[PDB]
Amino acid sequence: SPTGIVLMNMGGPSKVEETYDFLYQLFADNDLIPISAKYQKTIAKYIAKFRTPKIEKQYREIGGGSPIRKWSEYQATEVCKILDKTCPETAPHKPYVAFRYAKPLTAETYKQMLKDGVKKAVAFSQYPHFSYSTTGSSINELWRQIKALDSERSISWSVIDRWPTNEGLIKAFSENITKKLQEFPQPVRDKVVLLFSAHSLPMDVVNTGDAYPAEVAATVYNIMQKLKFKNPYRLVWQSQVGPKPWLGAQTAEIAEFLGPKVDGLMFIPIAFTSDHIETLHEIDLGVIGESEYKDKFKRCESLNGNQTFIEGMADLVKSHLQSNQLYSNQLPLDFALGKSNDPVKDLSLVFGNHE
Amino acid sequence: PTGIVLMNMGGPSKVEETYDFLYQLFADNDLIPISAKYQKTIAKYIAKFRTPKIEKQYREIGGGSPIRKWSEYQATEVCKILDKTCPETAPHKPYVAFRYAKPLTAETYKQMLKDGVKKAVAFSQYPHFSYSTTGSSINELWRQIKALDSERSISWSVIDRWPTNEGLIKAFSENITKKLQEFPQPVRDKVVLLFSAHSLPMDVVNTGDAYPAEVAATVYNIMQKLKFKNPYRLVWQSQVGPKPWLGAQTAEIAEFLGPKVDGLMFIPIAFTSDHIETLHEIDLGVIGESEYKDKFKRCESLNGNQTFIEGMADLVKSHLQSNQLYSNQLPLDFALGKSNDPVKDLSLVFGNHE
Ligand SMILES: [Co+2]
Numbered sequence: 001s002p003t004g005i006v007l008m009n010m011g012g013p014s015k016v017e018e019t020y021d022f023l024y025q026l027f028a029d030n031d032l033i034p035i036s037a038k039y040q041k042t043i044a045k046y047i048a049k050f051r052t053p054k055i056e057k058q059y060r061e062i063g064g065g066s067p068i069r070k071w072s073e074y075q076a077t078e079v080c081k082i083l084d085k086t087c088p089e090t091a092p093h094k095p096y097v098a099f100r101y102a103k104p105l106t107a108e109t110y111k112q113m114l115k116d117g118v119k120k121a122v123a124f125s126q127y128p129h130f131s132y133s134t135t136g137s138s139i140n141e142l143w144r145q146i147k148a149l150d151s152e153r154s155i156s157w158s159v160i161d162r163w164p165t166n167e168g169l170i171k172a173f174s175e176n177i178t179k180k181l182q183e184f185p186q187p188v189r190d191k192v193v194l195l196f197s198a199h200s201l202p203m204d205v206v207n208t209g210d211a212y213p214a215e216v217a218a219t220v221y222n223i224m225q226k227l228k229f230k231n232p233y234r235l236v237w238q239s240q241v242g243p244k245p246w247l248g249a250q251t252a253e254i255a256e257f258l259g260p261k262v263d264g265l266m267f268i269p270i271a272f273t274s275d276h277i278e279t280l281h282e283i284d285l286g287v288i289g290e291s292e293y294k295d296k297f298k299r300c301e302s303l304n305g306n307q308t309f310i311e312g313m314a315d316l317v318k319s320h321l322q323s324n325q326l327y328s329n330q331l332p333l334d335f336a337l338g339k340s341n342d343p344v345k346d347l348s349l350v351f352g353n354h355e
Numbered sequence: 356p357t358g359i360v361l362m363n364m365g366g367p368s369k370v371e372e373t374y375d376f377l378y379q380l381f382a383d384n385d386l387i388p389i390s391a392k393y394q395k396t397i398a399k400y401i402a403k404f405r406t407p408k409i410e411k412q413y414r415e416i417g418g419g420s421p422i423r424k425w426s427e428y429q430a431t432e433v434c435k436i437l438d439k440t441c442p443e444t445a446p447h448k449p450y451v452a453f454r455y456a457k458p459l460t461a462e463t464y465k466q467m468l469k470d471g472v473k474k475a476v477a478f479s480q481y482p483h484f485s486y487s488t489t490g491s492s493i494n495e496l497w498r499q500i501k502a503l504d505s506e507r508s509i510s511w512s513v514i515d516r517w518p519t520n521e522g523l524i525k526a527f528s529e530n531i532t533k534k535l536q537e538f539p540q541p542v543r544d545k546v547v548l549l550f551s552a553h554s555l556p557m558d559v560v561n562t563g564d565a566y567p568a569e570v571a572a573t574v575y576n577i578m579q580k581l582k583f584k585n586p587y588r589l590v591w592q593s594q595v596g597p598k599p600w601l602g603a604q605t606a607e608i609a610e611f612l613g614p615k616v617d618g619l620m621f622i623p624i625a626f627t628s629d630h631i632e633t634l635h636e637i638d639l640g641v642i643g644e645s646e647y648k649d650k651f652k653r654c655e656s657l658n659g660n661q662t663f664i665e666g667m668a669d670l671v672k673s674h675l676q677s678n679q680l681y682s683n684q685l686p687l688d689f690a691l692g693k694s695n696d697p698v699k700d701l702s703l704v705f706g707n708h709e
């Protein structure tokens with residue numbers, strides 16, 4: 001009986017047409033978005049069609065589609081082959097990806113899992129940095145899908161809610177960064193500023209006591225220790241949108257500011273593990289693309305298929321499996337500080353064997 | 356002939372050095388950007404207005420700030436070590452230069468010239484760099500070097516950060532561990548460890564200030580040493596005025612959690628000694644004013660901790676034993692900081708220039 005290793009993460013439209021459904025899924029979540037209730041399957045779509053055009057154009061601009069799913073199913077498949085020679089008592093490990101908004105959503109995957117006769121499953125969240133708005137929404141969803149497609153639970157779930165300083169992760173980022181630094185002049189290679197750029201969070205989420213901001217920061221300091229603080233660095237945030245206040249030190253804003261007085265700037269996808277709208281469009285076409293400093297701005301390659309990084313994940317899942325912990329010591333606290341309309345009341349009820 | 360000048364904001368030594376302190380404090384546009392054009396003016400207005408309450412706080416904790424004493428004690432103690440550890444740099448005289456508190460950089464730079472100091476190290480007692488603090492502190496030293504020592508007698512070098520100094524981490528660790536012993540065993544691994552650090556105006560945060568992330572580095576390191584035994588969270592205290600400030604307020608997080616936890620510990624993660632903030636904000640306010648005074652406890656401040664002091668002495672050793680009159684991060688710090696009177700060339704401020 002196969003052990004399910006399910007990679008999770010918010011998701012992105014495989015191909016341009018997928019935008020509508022992707023945007024619909026998004027705009028129908030109270031984990032954050034409305035209030036309402038069925039006066040909002042309505043209001044939801046009144047927002048989806050509105051927004052579809054813009055987004056399709058962005059994806060069209062990046063080859064047409066988010067590479068997330070491609071890369072995810074890949075990472076998931078490699079980490080399972082390794083887990084096969086590595087963790088034999090959990091013998092067959094099958095690759096599964098369950099995205100929060102993109103396809104396959106949690107329910108679709110859950111269905112496929114059961115019809116594959118899955119006993120044990122590991123909700124392996126692809127966000128090394130836990131945020132109730134990311135790794136949290138997947139859990140609150142997983143809960144519902146469990147209750148929906150599997151009451152009297154045939155599946156026993158455990159979850160890897162965070163891995164900010166996993167060795168593979170840190171080594172992978174270094175290397176990729178030195179590798180990218182090397183393609184800089186030299187008489188100025190040590191003066192290139194490393195801008196670690198993570199997706200930002202709204203202040204009324206940060207102030208909530210979210211664990212995201214500080215964890216990202218731990219990863220950053222770890223990579224710098226590895227590189228023996230050779231270059232100047234700084235943790236900045238991107239992707240903020242709307243009128244509300246967002247976690248400060250905006251990537252674009254600081255890029256343009258330093259653009260003149262610096263002779264080198266490197267952006268690093270610190271908070272995500274593959275390319276997606278954020279790197280390909282926001283940074284490559286935005287921050288770098290439209291800047292008059294295009295030349296002294298380069299982006300560190302996303303982890304993607306990086307082997308060292310894959311092995312890191314395998315190491316992770318293996319440690320998680322053999323530790324018998326259903327979730328990190330931090331999750332209960334997160335859930336007590338998080339904010340949702342349909343939360344998880346007891347984490348110990350969601351995860352574990354409930355025969 | 357070698358001065359080790361510890362530096363931090365400082366605190367009123369006597370219940371009334373307050374208005375002077377608060378004035379000096381808010382007159383600094385580098386700490387809290389209130390008015391680029393009328394900070395000083397708006398300053399004494401705020402000073403004279405907040406002096407009552409604050410003066411009463413300094414009296415609910417003994418009538419003064421212990422910062423000066425603790426600073427001086429650490430300074431000399433760290434210096435006693437350096438004499439046996441770095442004979443290579445003859446006598447090490449302990450100095451203290453407060454930004455807004457009594458021994459101001461002014462007073463202190465004078466002494467050092469009278470005592471004939473050739474070389475000195477500006478030792479920021481703020482493990483985590485921020486422009487509002489270390490920067491302000493430095494931007495002043497520059498002004499002092501310019502008015503008091505145009506000859507360029509003293510050779511300065513700065514310790515602008517030390518987020519993960521071994522002694523620091525280990526100290527905080529031991530101190531957190533023993534305090535958890537005060538909680539009943541059956542709950543010990545359940546106590547949430549709130550690392551409370553002085554908040555920052557969002558205005559400073561969005562400039563690219565290195566502080567928030569550096570505090571984060573210390574906290575994490577501390578949790579590894581503790582093998583993530585308990586739940587933890589980095590929260591923020593201290594703020595003022597309508598202006599928005601960082602993270603989750605310690606006060607609020609505390610009040611919200613009281614009902615959901617077995618216990619809460621507060622850790623002065625961002626400072627090196629007790630002062631108004633631990634002794635009052637936390638002890639009297641957060642802890643002693645909560646109907647949970649029992650399930651709430653405060654981790655001991657480093658103060659005169661030997662593990663801590665030895666790390667500082669050992670830190671100074673490393674520093675001296677090298678070039679770098681400042682770290683690799685400072686320049687960027689100065690590119691991102693915001694001041695009406697910044698240091699144009701860090702390269703000119705720290706060196707031999709004679
Ligand atoms: Co976004």
Ligand SMILES: [Co+2]
Pocket residue numbers: 553593
């Ligand atoms: Co303060």
